[PDB]
Design a protein around this ligand. Structure first.
Ligand SMILES: OC[C@H]1O[C@@](CO)(O[C@H]2O[C@H](CO)[C@@H](O)[C@H](O)[C@H]2O)[C@@H](O)[C@@H]1O
Lengths: 418, 555
DNA sequence: ACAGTCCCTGTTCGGGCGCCG
DNA sequence: ATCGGCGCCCGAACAGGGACTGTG
């Protein structure tokens, strides 16, 4: 098998990203993995004359004790050439299972003129030794070009199973294979084993999950149910008595929501505060204001019309920390034109770890974006840059890494969760 | 010892570039005879070859004294060649710290002699290292040479030698998997658990192994007994300390001098607990004149006295025990200044340190404490490869109300509370519901974009109003100024309604310090109050008192 | 709808300390 | 004068992004 020639986008160099510090648990796991990849010819040692680098770290696999080597190939993928239909029914299936088939890439060799760009450096504790640098000789997991170059072999491998089970939707994104069906949970789990063994005739899958009856939250990214995802509506308070402060919060909330919903009106509500009153003063709602509120309640309950996905535009996701372990998020492409608004709650590290929550929410939001649109959104994270970069690798378990930026949002966004 | 039989590292020029063609500047006669004598010497040693007119490249050459040595170091101003040499990915990711060293039975410190001059240079790249020795008589043309080994001053030499040394040690490390070798450039910390007799046997195996690869271990650089001078430290068998720090003593100081004093105090803060440099670094603000003389301020001199006070007493560090937990404890010394100590057994510090960074224009102690906890976490991963247990001067309940009420995701790893004042506290707390029987202030402010003049005032539910004219101000400042007025002209309980998310987002974060003088005044008022409720309403929407005060300040 | 001013954060480079040729 | 590479700190110039205001 001859390698496919791969180029960088015009006028762009390879990635040059420093390696971030790793724990002894992760370094010892990485050294063992890379030494075995070098023996099997999958990677090879290089020197400092290769001016490129990509960060590497290790994660513990989903419901497993084994380690998976994860490369932060975000910079290489932006600069990698572009290559050359998304199943709309995958999000309608009852059960959808994610299979890590990244191991299949290690069988296809990589173009020699391109291997220099896949370099990474394994650090050492206390800087005992210099960094030991490796480059890839085969298709690497997490590379934008790996699923494309392997696409021809993958359609061939899956075609018998897809014609034998035409009711099963099978989508591929990077190292992951998304397998959706409408079968019962037990017959669905048997079909996954049928696909694993059918794949096993050619390429190996991550070791069988040790638990087979779905323990709680171990299968977060494994067994996902798209038909149960719910959108978070915008709600307004219902009170018998309203104060001046209560109406001001209402008017400010409705004026902000008027950017997402056209028909929101706040004039008759603002009329109630025309004086210069005390915040605690109770204000009776006039007949005109009561009607204006009730119609706005109808509008916030009705779904938005005329919001469609644009495959050419990037996806953007914003998360809000609402407190009590609850996080609200919105995925959109243009401001105030949300493609989905959801809510995730009661995630790991209950009432202790905020970061463990956010890291899980980013993964859950990303999984939905891959399932629904086949893209990954750029995240606006409500967290400090150093707080995130210090801890995020400790709770990550996905094979992909979305782009993100950090923002300091004023907490006036109480306009998404009641 | 002939050149090392190690494979040369392929080196290229930057794409579409040629070699350097720089003419030789004049040199003094003391250095000319030394360079000629040295160059013919290091031609005999094989490091250098004579070249002819076929070589069109050149680089100026001089010769300085070796660092703390009677030998001469041959240096070349390869500034022109470094711009044209390909970029490298440096494999040296940091500096080893003694606090990360474990206890070992036998310790040896080696140093390779003529390190760069032992590793050959890529044959194809040697043409670009051409240089000319101008003779004494200006009539003589001068002798041209090229480099056969890693030249000193070339940007690729440190990385290639570091990469080359690892390849040379790899077979020996495999032949002895239980021998620990800390490798930094040419200095070798060798540690094993064998007996002292059998250890010297392995050291000789290592010296012979390096000699086969053209790496001599001179007796002058072979240390066999503690104490060990390693990476600027003194390595005693059960304790470690820093090589003597020399603080300069002067009656008048300059910018440069302050810059050296701050640096040495930072280098000392790794083991000396309590070093402060905030007031000394403040003297470096604004002045870019390096030789400008600076009078020591009252706060700066006090800081220098404190540092010398804790520097007169000797401090030592301890080595690392992989079986015992790693513990770090932080204390708040000054405003914006923190010191910490990482230890395993109490009062037996592995290392110390300090965090004194002002992150943001407005912040509080809880933010800075969390920022310092992260700096220690990262530093701990580098030295020991694990996250330490924490002992923080902040109440468990203080942090619970902060991280649950804060809009960003903030977390601190496993930590326990220590009652070592001064403690970290929230100096004021905004009410979640409007206060009954509290005067309601509708504040706003404005400013002209061209005139830079503005107004700031408020109206209340009791009919009270106020408008203050401001000069040389902005829109953002007047909304903060309006909130300051309401806090001034109110009782201990006040309700304030603003239309500025900017002013709201600053105050809602509960800052206790700010680079803005006005915010610090606002903070001072909030601590004096007993109950404060801050509410936001959208501007220009005909809402309540916001409309009344809006017309007062926009005119 | 576009163009500025303000403010804020982050990156980058300069000084210094320290290591080593 | 006059060097390479690395790490750390502190200070400052530059740029990027979001919100507000003024304007066609
Ligand atoms: O998290 C910011 C951090 O990311 C870095 C390296 O981790 O850059 C990588 O990650 C970014 C996060 O979105 C990507 O945008 C970028 O493409 C990728 O190289 C650093 O830039 C930064 O310190």
């Amino acid at each position: 098998i001859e390698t496919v020639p791969v180029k960088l986008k015009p006028g762009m160099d390879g990635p040059k990203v420093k390696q971030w510090p790793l724990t002894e648990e992760k370094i010892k796991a990485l050294v063992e993995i890379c030494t075995e990849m070098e023996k099997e010819g999958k990677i090879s040692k290089i020197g400092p004359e290769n001016p490129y680098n990509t960060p590497v770290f290790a994660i513990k696999k989903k419901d497993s004790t084994k380690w998976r080597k994860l490369v932060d190939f975000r910079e290489l993928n932006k600069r990698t050439q572009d290559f050359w239909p998304h199943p709309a029914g995958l999000k309608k299936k009852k059960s959808v299972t994610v299979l890590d088939v990244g191991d299949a890439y290690f069988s296809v060799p990589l173009d020699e003129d391109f291997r220099k760009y896949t370099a990474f450096t394994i650090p050492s504790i206390n800087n005992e030794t210099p960094g030991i640098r490796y480059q890839y000789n085969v298709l690497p997991q997490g590379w934008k070009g790996s699923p494309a170059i392997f696409q021809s072999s993958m359609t061939k491998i899956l075609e018998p199973f897809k014609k034998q089970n035409p009711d099963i939707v099978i989508y591929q994104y990077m190292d992951d294979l998304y397998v959706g069906s409408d079968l019962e949970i037990g017959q669905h789990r048997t079909k996954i084993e049928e696909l694993r063994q059918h794949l096993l005739r050619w390429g190996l899958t991550t070791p069988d999950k040790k638990h087979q009856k779905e323990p709680p939250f171990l299968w977060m990214g494994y067994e996902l149910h798209p038909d149960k995802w719910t959108v978070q509506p915008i709600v307004l308070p219902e009170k018998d008595s309203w104060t001046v402060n209560d109406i001001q919060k209402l008017v400010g909330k409705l004026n902000w929501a008027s950017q997402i919903y056209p028909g929101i009106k706040v004039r008759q509500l603002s009329k109630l505060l025309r004086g210069t009153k005390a915040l605690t003063e109770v204000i009776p709602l006039t007949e005109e204001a009561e009607l204006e509120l009730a119609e706005n309640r109808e509008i916030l309950k009705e779904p938005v019309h005329g919001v469609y996905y644009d495959p050419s535009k990037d996806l953007i996701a914003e998360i809000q920390k609402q407190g009590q372990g609850q996080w609200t998020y919105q995925i959109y492409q243009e401001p105030f034109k949300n493609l989905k608004t959801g809510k995730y709650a009661r995630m790991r590290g209950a009432h202790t770890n905020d970061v463990k929550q956010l890291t899980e929410a980013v993964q859950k939001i990303t999984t939905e974006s891959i399932v629904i649109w086949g893209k990954t959104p750029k995240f606006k994270l409500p967290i400090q840059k150093e707080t995130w970069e210090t801890w995020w690798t400790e709770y990550w378990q996905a094979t992909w890494i979305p782009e993100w930026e950090f923002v300091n949002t004023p907490p006036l966004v109480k306009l998404w969760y009641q | 010892v002939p050149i090392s039989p190690i494979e040369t590292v392929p080196v290229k020029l930057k794409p579409g570039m040629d070699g350097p063609k720089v003419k030789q500047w004049p040199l003094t006669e003391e250095k000319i005879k030394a360079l000629v004598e040295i160059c013919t010497e290091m031609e005999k040693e094989g490091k250098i070859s004579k070249i002819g007119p076929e070589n069109p490249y050149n680089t100026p050459v001089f010769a300085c004294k070796k660092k703390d040595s009677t030998k001469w170091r041959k240096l070349v101003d390869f500034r022109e060649l470094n711009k044209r040499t390909q970029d490298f990915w440096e494999v040296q990711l940091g500096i080893p710290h003694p606090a990360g060293l474990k206890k070992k039975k036998s310790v040896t410190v080696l140093d390779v002699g003529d390190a760069y001059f032992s590793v050959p240079l890529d044959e194809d790249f040697r043409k670009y290292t051409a240089f000319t020795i101008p003779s004494i008589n200006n009539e003589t043309p001068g002798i041209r040479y090229q480099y056969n080994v890693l030249p000193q001053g070339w940007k690729g030499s440190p990385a290639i030698f570091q990469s080359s040394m690892t390849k040379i040690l790899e077979p020996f490390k495999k032949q002895n998997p239980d021998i620990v070798i800390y490798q930094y450039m040419d200095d070798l910390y060798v540690g094993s658990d064998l007996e002292i007799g059998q250890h010297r046997t392995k050291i000789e195996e290592l010296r012979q192994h390096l000699l086969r690869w053209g790496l001599t271990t001179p007796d002058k650089k072979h240390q066999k007994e503690p104490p060990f001078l390693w990476m600027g430290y003194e390595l005693h068998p059960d304790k470690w300390t820093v090589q003597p720090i020399v603080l300069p003593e002067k009656d008048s100081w300059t910018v440069n001098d302050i810059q050296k004093l701050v640096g040495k105090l930072n280098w000392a803060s790794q083991i000396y607990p309590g070093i402060k440099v905030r007031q000394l670094s403040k003297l470096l603000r604004g002045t870019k004149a390096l030789t400008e003389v600076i009078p020591l301020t009252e706060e700066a001199e006090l800081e220098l006295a404190e540092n010398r006070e804790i520097l007169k007493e000797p401090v030592h560090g301890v080595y690392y025990d992989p079986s015992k937990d790693l513990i770090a404890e932080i204390q708040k010394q000054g405003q914006g200044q923190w010191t910490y100590q990482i230890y395993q057994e109490p009062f037996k510090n592995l290392k110390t340190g300090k965090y004194a960074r002002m992150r943001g224009a407005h912040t509080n102690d809880v933010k800075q404490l969390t920022e310092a906890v992260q700096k220690i976490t990262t530093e701990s991963i580098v030295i020991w490869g694990k996250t330490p247990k924490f002992k923080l001067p902040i109440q468990k309940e203080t942090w619970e109300t902060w991280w649950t009420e804060y809009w960003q995701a903030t977390w601190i790893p496993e930590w326990e509370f220590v009652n070592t004042p001064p403690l970290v506290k929230l100096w004021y707390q905004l009410e979640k519901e409007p206060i009954v029987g509290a005067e309601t202030f509708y504040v706003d402010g404005a400013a002209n974009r061209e005139t830079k003049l503005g107004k700031a005032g408020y109206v209340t539910n009791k009919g009270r109003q106020k408008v203050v004219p401001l000069t040389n101000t902005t829109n953002q400042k007047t909304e903060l100024q309006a909130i300051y007025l309401a806090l001034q002209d109110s009782g201990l309980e006040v309700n304030i309604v603003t239309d500025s998310q900017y002013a709201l987002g600053i105050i809602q974060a509960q800052p206790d310090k700010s680079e803005s003088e006005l915010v610090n005044q606002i903070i001072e008022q909030l601590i004096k109050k007993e109950k404060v409720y801050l509410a936001w309403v959208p501007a220009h929407k005909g809402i309540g008192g916001n409309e009344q005060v809006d017309k007062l300040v926009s005119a």
